DNA sequence: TGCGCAACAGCATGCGCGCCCAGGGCTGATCGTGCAAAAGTCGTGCCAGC
DNA sequence: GCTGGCACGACTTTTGCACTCGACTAAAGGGGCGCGCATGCTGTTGCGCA
RNA sequence: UGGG
């Protein structure tokens, strides 16, 4: 609860790498929903060298994120919280897009109540321990062969 | 507010149990030792610069009589709760502070720092706090205002008494017994028993849980003490901190 | 008279009968409860059982 | 659904509501000093709300520094209307004058008679009209609707009250008569004290600590049990012994009462007077008559050798003056002589005061 | 039910919870959490103090509503004072600063 | 009545401050000694304040010029 | 004494005065909101159906909690924040909420469909109206693969919308459904099966493009037409409704 | 309980989730009407006066 | 001696609540009197 | 539960080392209950009330 | 890991109702901590305005007086 | 080499555990002389008024 | 000359420091503290200087 | 005992 989110722009270059999860054969989450939002860190580069898509920080939405989906770039460097380093709060540009209203966050946000409670609203409908399903009851898989869905 | 005057010291049960204590390790003795010896029994000899026994010596009544015949003068031991007041009264804060500072500077280990670190930070923060060590034990005990313990007499049951009200008449009753029996010039066994009964009375008044857990005759139950009567559930939740019923609600 | 009148008068196995419908009376008279003097109170001992 | 021990909790009794006039003034649009003056007025309001102290005493007690009586007077008349049809103002006239102002403001023969009756001659017309009918100029029964309208006019206040404290005796001590003997059997007897000691005894071995606690938990508890059970048994035995001594010593069924020196009843058990007289203060007695173990211990020498104190005399004196005065004797000395004919040696001088006392109409009945 | 103004308890100066005897229902902790999630200070501020624990906020607030002023004028809760005294009974000292 | 406030906030975007500005204007019109610059729908002065903010002629600077002007003229 | 004038003055009081609603086990913040009351005759409270999904409750007769804001600034904090018309997107997923369900999905799903033959097949008429046939007689709701001329709107121009019309193949229910769609929404969104996945992203894009008010009143019109024509559908369930496969037995 | 003639459909969206709609005929026929009985007590006691 | 209100002066500005141990002298500074008897209220007198 | 002898395996999870512990409880109708238990030390132990 | 997080806060009034009150009141009573009333729950308990949202404005203004006297 | 020092393993004890909403019945307290001093009550006599 | 109000006087009642007194008593009473987890006391095991 |  203690985050007041007071300062607007801390002006730091630190960020976190953003890549798709790509777990196993079937990807769990695409790159669009992960890149969409927050604020771009440093720059991004198309496969053509010496070509910058965005001027340092930008507000990612359907236009810009769709332009990123139109290219082959697989990863985006994005600044976020715990990289803000600001004192007695969180910078407004470091944590962007609280959602709800479709514009940027302004001073006085609710922050960690929307955190927490946003996460705490689920958990009632969960199945908790999913043990004993073990599929067909066989132990792991004996075949070490590797296949592919596409080429 | 109001208050009461004991005429005898107590252990202030709100301390020394209370999660790892600020008392036992402050005097550098095992907690169980002080817990058993602080009232009504053992010796707890203090000072004794010319005596061969240690200042912290825990020696039982056997070595206490052995100290009466063998040692005599220069050996001063208080079997009551006043031994902590004198021994802690003679405690030097600065000499122990710099002594533990130089001891932690010269020698250090994996188990050394934790023992040293808790003690040194506690003593430094205690000196910078401004409070006196002897104030842990209470000479005067204040009483709750009358309205915070409403009787609420009922026509069926005449005057109703709260469960926590009887603690005051009990501690004042045993206190008047100890004071009336004190100046009477009686044997030491009876006055030691009185110090133990008053100790259990005050300790039961401040903290109901653990110890004697005194039970009512009619309604049984642990009843409630100041520790459980803070607010509600012994949180802030029930009568405060969004526990208020406001007005103009639903249904 | 105080023992038997106290047991029939006040107890956790002796309560008011539900007067609504005869079936609530019949299923109220026929019931099984793990509670009682030996008892299983609540909260505790509640999983496999 | 009984919830074990039940709520049994402090509960924070919500009743209060002795006087709401403070909450009434809190909503009055005063300026500055009118609020303080109003608080000074409402503090002097009696529980009955009829005649409250003196108007001059208020102003003298305000610490005026100017602020003349013309203001506080308008505050009086101002609050009296916002009051439940009225409060205070005393004089006994202002109550009925304000009650009739805003009530109706019309009917046959309301204000025409009400102004003169309320202004003057009221107390003269309270007993009976008679010649006053010639003073008011009214003819025969024209005033019947007027006085009849005043009857419904009515203590002015005491409408809210909300005093749940009815103060009941309940049980206490009881006595019974049977088989030719009206002897109390101490018909209370909760047995809780007896039961608790028996029940608490079970409790001492129930600590289940493993600490034994023989030194403090066991001996102290036992001592407390002996201390409370012995005290309750001694108090019940003393109350039963005094109830039997007063029972046997005097008989209620028999006409009249016998005076008992505090000493005779104290000399029966050979106990000091203070100990028993203190036990007879708050302890009552319930038999099949009336509704106190204090009025049955009245002591008096009756000022005569032939016979009983004053209770017998007082009841008898009211039973005498009850039916008497076929004409209009309005006489106390004649009752003292008739009482002296029985050998009671009544003074007949202080007799009237005793007779007059406790709601007796005498001697004002003349 | 729809309680407006009922009787008040002698302790903590709070209304009651029961119907017929006019309970004020309940306003809990998660509701304060939600009102903090909206970021409304005054909407919760009136419900924490004036509508519940303020003795003078009752009469003065109601007087301002009858006149149509609609002024808050917050006040100090009594339950916090109850906690104060309950701590003062213990050997622990707590005091306000000027 | 104004169902959507997004215009009046779209004037000067906060969505927190409209409560304070429309609150002060709501005190100016609510208490007394002032008149609305927009014709009334019979609605309460609250929606009048919201539509005055939606008109663009009431803001923090305007209230400062009116407050300092009426305070300096007296 | 509840005089008749007190009811009129009370009507003057309740008109724009907001009243906030909350449920007993509030988890997220949308569990408590602020709404405008309108007096109704009855002992219960009528709640908007689409907002019910935000409370995650159902109607078995559940009770509720109601609070009345006092003073002034509280009314501005209720009107500027807790109005459900003010905030739609929930601050968790980003996917919109209050999105219609239950009967609306049957009205829009039964609305959009086509079939072979039936009544009228295809025809040549002028749209978008097409209200002179189905709404009277001569055609069917989900029948015909009806070609009609329709005018679109394009927002690619800055600050201005350009109109474009053309003839397209569609169904009666879809062409009637296009009447509700304001302005610059593309026409390819209304031709689909509408499995609630179409209304989810349809209201999502509508809010993210045209803004708050047009998707609020647009979703409202979707509600009214959804329960209206959902009631026009008249579906039912029965014993013959369920069919057991003939092979199943053998497999067992 | 009492039998009724059930029809299964939505009617102008008035049925939502588990709710139900009733005709006025059920009200006019007096069906689904109950009677309650409440006990009132007043005590007269002998006080100190 | 007139126009005095103790409710208006009961509200003051306060910030940064502190917690500290108590001393017997400061406890006596709060002491308005002493209770010398365990008894509470008399049943016959109905007064403390 | 009826009074008598109960042989219980306790589920064999106590010290986490995966050792089975078989205990038993003789419970009369009234009076003190008698219990026999095994510790991981492989020695017999008795718990009385 | 959130088990010591609320217990290690620099304000003794907050989180005291979240966990055991004994150790918090003993360590705070001996240490002499000052709360400064910078937490949300503390302003909710005391009754002062919340330093967030619409209140964050007001609490900002008074803030510039703090260091300025 | 054996004793000496330090570390690790086992046993005990303490703290905890969702919200809201409604009805019904009762339920610890008080000990108990003697002596002395104070206050109240009751009775008688005197004065005042009719 | 008679009636009613008031004054004086006892004796009669009200009141305040004081201690008293030891019981005893065995039966009853609770059991299963659902649980999990973290922190501290101690005893035994392993490893080094000399 | 019962309702979400």
Curated annotation (Swiss-Prot), chain A:
> Which residues bind Zn(2+) 2 per the record?
10, 84, 91, 94
What does UniProt say on post-translational modification here? Acetylated on several lysine residues in the presence of glucose.
Task: Show the stretches that span the lipid bilayer.
Answer: none
Its practical application is: Co-administration of salinamide and rifampicin or salinamide and myxopyronin suppresses the emergence of resistance to both antibiotics.
| Entry function | DNA-dependent RNA polymerase (RNAP) catalyzes the transcription of DNA into RNA using the four ribonucleoside triphosphates as substrates. Resistance to the antibiotics salinamide A, salinamide B, rifampicin, streptolydigin, CBR703, myxopyronin, and lipiarmycin can result from mutations in this protein.
Assembly and oligomerization: The RNAP catalytic core consists of 2 alpha, 1 beta, 1 beta' and 1 omega subunit. When a sigma factor is associated with the core the holoenzyme is formed, which can initiate transcription. The rRNA transcription and antitermination complex (rrnTAC) consists of RNAP, NusA, NusB, NusE (rpsJ), NusG, SubB, ribosomal protein S4, DNA and precursor rRNA; S4 is more flexible than other subunits.
Q: Which family does it belong to?
A: Belongs to the RNA polymerase beta' chain family.
Name of the protein in question: DNA-directed RNA polymerase subunit beta'
Native organism: Escherichia coli (strain K12)
**Taxonomic path:** Bacteria, Pseudomonadati, Pseudomonadota, Gammaproteobacteria, Enterobacterales
> Shown portion of the whole protein?
805 to 955 of 1407
From Swiss-Prot, chain E:
| Modification comment | Acetylated on several lysine residues in the presence of glucose.
The entry's protein name is DNA-directed RNA polymerase subunit beta
Biotechnology remark: Co-administration of salinamide and rifampicin or salinamide and myxopyronin suppresses the emergence of resistance to both antibiotics.
Top-rank lineage group of the source organism = Bacteria
Its quaternary structure?
The RNAP catalytic core consists of 2 alpha, 1 beta, 1 beta' and 1 omega subunit. When a sigma factor is associated with the core the holoenzyme is formed, which can initiate transcription. The rRNA transcription and antitermination complex (rrnTAC) consists of RNAP, NusA, NusB, NusE (rpsJ), NusG, SubB, ribosomal protein S4, DNA and precursor rRNA; S4 is more flexible than other subunits. In pull-down experiments interacts with CedA.
Q: Which family does it belong to?
A: Belongs to the RNA polymerase beta chain family.
* Function, in words: DNA-dependent RNA polymerase (RNAP) catalyzes the transcription of DNA into RNA using the four ribonucleoside triphosphates as substrates. Resistance to the antibiotics salinamide A, salinamide B, rifampicin, streptolydigin, CBR703, myxopyronin, and lipiarmycin can result from mutations in this protein.
Please name the taxonomic classification of the source: Bacteria, Pseudomonadati, Pseudomonadota, Gammaproteobacteria, Enterobacterales
Swiss-Prot record, chain F:
Question: What keywords would UniProt list here?
Answer: DNA-directed RNA polymerase, Nucleotidyltransferase, Transcription, Transferase
Report if keyword Nucleotidyltransferase is assigned: yes
Q: Does the keyword Transcription apply?
A: yes
Reaction catalysed by this enzyme: RNA(n) + a ribonucleoside 5'-triphosphate = RNA(n+1) + diphosphate
Offer a single GO CC term for the protein.
RNA polymerase complex
| Enzyme Commission number | 2.7.7.6
Gene Ontology biological-process entries: bacterial-type flagellum assembly; bacterial-type flagellum-dependent cell motility; cell motility; cellular response to cell envelope stress; DNA-templated transcription initiation; intracellular iron ion homeostasis; nitrate assimilation; protein-containing complex assembly
Q: Which GO terms describe its molecular function?
A: bacterial-type RNA polymerase core enzyme binding; DNA binding; DNA-directed RNA polymerase activity
- Domain of life of the source: Bacteria
Note the subunit structure.
The RNAP catalytic core consists of 2 alpha, 1 beta, 1 beta' and 1 omega subunit. When a sigma factor is associated with the core the holoenzyme is formed, which can initiate transcription. The rRNA transcription and antitermination complex (rrnTAC) consists of RNAP, NusA, NusB, NusE (rpsJ), NusG, SubB, ribosomal protein S4, DNA and precursor rRNA; S4 is more flexible than other subunits.
Function, as annotated? Promotes RNA polymerase (RNAP) assembly. Latches the N- and C-terminal regions of the beta' subunit thereby facilitating its interaction with the beta and alpha subunits. Part of the processive rRNA transcription and antitermination complex (rrnTAC). The complex forms an RNA-chaperone ring around the RNA exit tunnel of RNAP. It supports rapid transcription and antitermination of rRNA operons, cotranscriptional rRNA folding, and annealing of distal rRNA regions to allow correct ribosome biogenesis.
In the record, the note on similarity to other proteins reads: Belongs to the RNA polymerase subunit omega family.
Q: What is this protein called?
A: DNA-directed RNA polymerase subunit omega
């Amino acid at each position: 609860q203690d985050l007041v989110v007071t300062e607007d722009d801390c002006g730091t270059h630190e960020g976190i790498m953003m890549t798709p999860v790509i777990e196993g054969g079937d990807v769990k989450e695409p790159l669009r929903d992960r890149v969409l939002g927050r604020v771009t860190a440093e720059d991004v580069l198309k496969p053509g060298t010496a070509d910058i898509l965005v001027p340092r920080n930008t507000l990612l939405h359907e236009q810009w994120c769709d332009l990123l989906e139109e290219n082959s770039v697989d990863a985006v460097k994005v600044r976020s919280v715990v990289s803000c380093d600001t004192d007695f709060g969180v910078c407004a540009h470091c944590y962007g897009r609280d959602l709800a209203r479709g514009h940027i966050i302004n001073k006085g946000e609710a922050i960690g109540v929307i955190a927490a409670q946003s996460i705490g609203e689920p958990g009632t409908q969960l199945t908790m321990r999913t043990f004993h399903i073990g599929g067909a009851a066989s132990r792991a898989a004996a075949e070490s062969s590797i296949q592919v869905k596409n080429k | 507010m109001g208050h009461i005057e004991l005429a005898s010291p107590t252990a202030h049960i709100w301390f020394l149990k209370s999660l790892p204590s600020r008392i036992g390790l402050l005097l550098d003795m095992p907690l169980r030792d002080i817990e058993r010896v602080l009232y009504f029994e053992s010796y707890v000899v203090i000072e004794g610069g010319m005596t061969n026994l240690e200042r912290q010596q825990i020696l039982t009544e056997e070595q206490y009589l052995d100290a009466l015949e063998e040692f005599g003068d220069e050996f001063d031991a208080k079997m009551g709760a006043e031994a902590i007041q004198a021994l802690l009264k003679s405690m030097d804060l600065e000499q122990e502070c710099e002594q533990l500072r130089e001891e932690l500077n010269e020698t250090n280990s994996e188990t050394k720092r934790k023992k040293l670190t808790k003690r040194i930070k506690l003593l430094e923060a205690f000196v910078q706090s401004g409070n006196k060590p002897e104030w842990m034990i209470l000479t005067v005990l204040p009483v709750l205002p009358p309205d915070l313990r409403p009787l609420v007499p009922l026509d069926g049951g005449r005057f109703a008494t709260s469960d926590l009200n009887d603690l005051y008449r009990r501690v004042i009753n045993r206190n008047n017994r100890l004071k009336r029996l004190l100046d009477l010039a009686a044997p030491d066994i009876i006055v030691r028993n009185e110090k133990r009964m008053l100790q259990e009375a005050v300790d039961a008044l401040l903290d109901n849980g653990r110890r004697g857990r005194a039970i009512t005759g009619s309604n049984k139950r642990p009843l409630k003490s100041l520790a459980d009567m803070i607010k509600g559930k012994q949180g802030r939740f029930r009568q405060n901190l969004l526990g208020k019923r406001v007005d103009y609600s639903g249904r | 008279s105080a023992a038997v009148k106290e047991f029939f008068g006040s107890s956790q196995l002796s309560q008011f009968m539900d007067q609504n419908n005869p079936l609530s009376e019949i299923t109220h008279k026929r019931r099984i409860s793990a509670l009682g003097p030996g008892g299983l109170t609540r909260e505790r001992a509640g999983f496999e059982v | 659904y009984q919830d074990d021990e039940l709520p049994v909790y402090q509960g924070e009794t919500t009743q209060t509501l002795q006087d709401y006039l403070m909450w009434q003034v809190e909503l009055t649009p005063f300026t500055d000093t009118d609020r303080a003056i109003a608080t000074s007025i409402v503090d002097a309001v009696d529980d009955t709300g009829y005649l409250t102290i003196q108007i001059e005493d208020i102003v003298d007690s305000i610490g005026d520094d100017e602020i003349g009586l013309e203001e506080v007077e308008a505050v009086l008349k101002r609050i009296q209307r916002f009051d439940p049809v009225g409060v205070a103002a005393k004089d006994l006239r202002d109550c009925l004058l304000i009650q009739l102002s805003q009530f109706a403001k019309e009917t046959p023969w309301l204000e025409e008679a009400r102004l003169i009756i309320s202004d003057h001659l009221d107390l003269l017309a309270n007993h009976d009209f008679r010649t006053l009918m010639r003073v008011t100029r009214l003819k025969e029964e024209v005033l019947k609707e007027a006085v009849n309208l005043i009857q419904s006019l009515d203590x002015x206040x005491x409408x809210x009250x909300x005093x749940x404290x009815x103060x009941x005796x309940x049980x206490x001590x009881x006595x019974x008569x049977x088989x030719x003997x009206x002897x109390x059997x101490x018909x209370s007897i909760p047995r809780l004290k007896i039961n608790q000691q028996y029940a608490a005894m079970g409790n001492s071995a129930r600590n289940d600590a493993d600490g034994q606690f023989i030194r403090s938990n066991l001996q102290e508890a036992r001592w407390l049990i002996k201390s409370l059970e012995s005290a309750n048994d001694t108090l019940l035995r003393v109350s039963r012994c005094i109830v039997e001594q007063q029972q046997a010593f005097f008989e209620q069924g028999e006409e009249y009462m016998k005076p008992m020196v505090l000493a005779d009843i104290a000399q029966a058990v050979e106990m000091h007077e203070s100990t028993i007289s203190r036990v007879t203060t708050q302890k009552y007695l319930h038999s099949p008559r009336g509704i106190x173990x204090x009025x049955x211990x009245x002591x008096x020498x009756x000022x005569x050798x032939x016979x009983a104190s004053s209770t017998a005399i007082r009841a008898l004196v009211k039973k005498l003056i009850a039916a008497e005065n076929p004409a209009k004797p309005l006489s106390d000395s004649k009752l003292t002589s008739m009482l002296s004919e029985q050998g009671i040696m009544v003074a007949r001088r202080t007799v009237a005061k005793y007779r007059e006392s406790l709601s007796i109409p005498p001697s004002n009945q003349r | 039910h729809a309680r407006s103004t009922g009787s008040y308890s002698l302790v903590t100066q709070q209304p009651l919870g029961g119907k017929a005897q006019f309970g004020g229902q309940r306003f809990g902790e998660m509701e304060v959490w939600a009102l903090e999630a909206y970021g409304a200070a005054y909407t919760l501020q009136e419900m924490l103090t004036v509508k519940s624990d303020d003795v003078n906020g009752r009469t003065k607030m109601y007087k301002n509503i009858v006149d149509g002023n609609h002024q808050m004028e917050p006040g100090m809760p009594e339950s916090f004072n109850v906690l104060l005294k309950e701590i003062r009974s213990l050997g622990i000292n707590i005091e306000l600063e000027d | 009545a104004r169902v959507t406030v997004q215009d009046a906030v779209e004037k000067i975007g906060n969505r927190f401050d409209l409560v304070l500005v429309a609150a002060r204007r709501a005190r100016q019109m609510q208490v007394g000694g002032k008149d609305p610059l927009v014709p009334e729908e019979n609605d309460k002065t609250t929606v009048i304040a919201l539509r005055e903010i939606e008109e663009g002629l009431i803001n923090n600077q305007i209230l400062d010029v009116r407050e300092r002007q009426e305070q300096q003229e007296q | 004494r509840e005089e008749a004038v007190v009811w009129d003055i009370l009507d003057e009081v309740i008109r724009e005065h907001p009243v906030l609603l909350n449920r007993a086990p509030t988890l997220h913040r949308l569990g408590i909101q602020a709404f405008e009351p309108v007096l109704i005759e009855g002992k219960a409270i009528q709640l908007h159906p689409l907002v019910c999904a935000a409370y995650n409750a159902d109607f078995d007769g559940d009770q509720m909690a109601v609070h009345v804001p006092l003073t002034l600034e509280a009314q501005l904090e209720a009107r500027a924040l807790m109005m459900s018309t003010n905030n739609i997107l929930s601050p968790a997923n980003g996917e919109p909420i209050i999105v219609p369900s239950q009967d609306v999905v049957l009205g829009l799903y039964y609305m959009t469909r086509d079939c072979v033959n039936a009544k009228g097949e295809g025809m040549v008429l002028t749209g978008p109206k097409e209200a002179e046939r189905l709404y009277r007689s001569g055609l069917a709701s989900l029948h015909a693969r009806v070609k009609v001329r329709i005018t679109e709107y394009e927002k690619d121009a800055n600050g201005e919308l350009v109109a474009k019309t053309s003839l397209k193949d569609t169904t009666v229910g879809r062409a009637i459904l296009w009447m509700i769609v304001p302005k610059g929404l593309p026409y390819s969104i209304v031709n689909q099966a509408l499995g609630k996945k179409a209304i989810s992203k349809m209201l999502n894009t509508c809010y993210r493009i045209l803004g708050l008010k047009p998707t609020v009143i647009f979703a409202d019109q979707i509600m009214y037409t959804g329960f209206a024509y959902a009631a026009r559908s008249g579906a039912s369930v029965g014993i013959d409704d369920m069919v057991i496969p003939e092979k199943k037995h053998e497999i067992i | 309980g009492q039998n009724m003639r059930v029809a299964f459909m939505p009617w102008n969206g008035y049925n939502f989730e588990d709710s139900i709609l009733v005709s006025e005929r059920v009200v006019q026929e007096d069906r689904f009407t109950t009677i309650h009985i409440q006990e009132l007590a007043c005590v007269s006691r002998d006080t100190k006066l | 001696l007139l126009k005095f209100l103790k409710a208006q002066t009961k509200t003051e500005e306060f910030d940064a609540i502190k917690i500290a141990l108590a001393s017997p002298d400061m406890i006596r500074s709060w002491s308005f009197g002493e209770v010398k008897k365990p008894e509470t209220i008399n049943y016959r007198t109905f007064k403390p | 539960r009826s009074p008598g002898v109960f042989f219980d395996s306790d589920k064999g999870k106590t010290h986490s080392s995966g050792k089975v512990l078989y205990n038993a409880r003789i419970i009369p109708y009234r009076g003190s209950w008698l219990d026999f238990e095994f510790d991981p030390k492989d020695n017999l132990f008795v718990r009385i009330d | 890991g959130i088990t010591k997080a609320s217990l290690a806060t620099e304000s003794f009034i907050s989180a005291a109702s979240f966990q055991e009150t004994t150790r918090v009141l003993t360590e705070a009573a001996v240490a002499g901590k000052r709360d400064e009333l910078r937490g949300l729950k503390e302003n909710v308990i005391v009754g002062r305005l919340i330093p967030a949202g619409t209140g964050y404005a007001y609490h900002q203004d008074r803030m510039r007086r703090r260091a300025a006297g």
